[model samples]
Target: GMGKRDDLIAQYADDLRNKCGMEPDMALLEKVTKGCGPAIYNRDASTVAGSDTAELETIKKNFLMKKLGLADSESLMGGIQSVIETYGRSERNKYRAVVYYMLTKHFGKESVYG
Candidate 1:
């Protein structure tokens, strides 16, 4: 059970460094991954659809505003847009963990995970 989770974490770390051009804090990444709960294990929920407006809005409303405890603002949507661009628009396998992790770091909201 834990093995699969750990594997996904490592994959997310790779996306952070290789795709997103950010150095990953392993401890923080682990906490963020845990925060995602069982969603990370589900195939559809595991990866974010960067091109989908509905999906992006849900992230802004749910994960960014709710989980990260951020106020609703233009910056919230901008932050999500920026992270998706950073992850690469053509990159098909945009892991949700990576997207959330980037947003977590983008807004300096790592403390949310703590």
Candidate 2:
């Protein structure tokens, strides 16, 4: 059921891509969608606070690049928190990070993230 649902979402996302240039990561569209609800995707449940827009913007500026693998998880956590804050709706934001990583990788921009 999950597979079918994921496939369906992918199809719809793809459709939307053509419809409105909406970009969705096909590699992680499903894994990202599986976790839905409050505090569902936080690796550390203790840090689970409500989402924020400003923090999300900060995340997009600082993290979500080769920076993901560049630093220790502790230092990189705020970036992850940005993802959590930016797109925590229905408890889904790691996917956004995944997409960011994938996009930076796709663009082959080492300098920007470095």
Candidate 3:
């Protein structure tokens, strides 16, 4: 069981390293795994705009897209949709997970197993 989990973490960390080009940090790692997605899109934005009312799509664009240098928004959507198709997940919940997965890896969040 531990071996499986460790391998899983290594895979996540390896993927992060290859795709995002970074090492993990404490604050980010905690956020992504704490829930279905990161609890707060941005601490400053959430405080100012209010979490419930904030436009998260815009938040994702400003933060993750720019950070990752993602050229096409449609491409990200396609990737997310692919995850949904392959995993048999609902877009609503699964998309959130994708966002978290994308952001955490891109931003150097630690993996669960490693």
Q: What tens digits encode model 3's per-residue C-alpha lDDT throughout 1-114?
A: 455434434444554454444554434544444443334333242221212224445544654465445555665545533333433332222234334565445444334324
RMSD of 3: 10.9
Model 1 superposed RMSD (Cα): 1.9
How many Å off is the CA of 26 in candidate 1? 0.7
Superposed by TM-score, candidate 3 places the C-alpha of residue 30 at a distance from the truth, in angstroms, of 3.9
Q: Runs in model 2 with CA error above 4 Å?
A: 1-22, 25-68, 73-75, 89-114
TM-score, per-candidate, Cα-based: 0.91, 0.30, 0.31
> Cα-based RMSD of the predictions, in order?
1.9, 9.2, 10.9
Clashing pairs in 3: none
lDDT of 3 at 86: 39
Give the alpha carbon lDDT tens digit for every residue of 1-114 in model 2: 466454445543554355324476554444333422232333443122336556544444554333433434443445455434444346432333343543344434434532
Q: Candidate 3: deviation at residue 80, Å?
A: 1.9
Ranking by lDDT: 1, 3, 2
C-alpha lDDT score of every prediction, in listed order: 0.88, 0.42, 0.42
TM-score of 2: 0.30
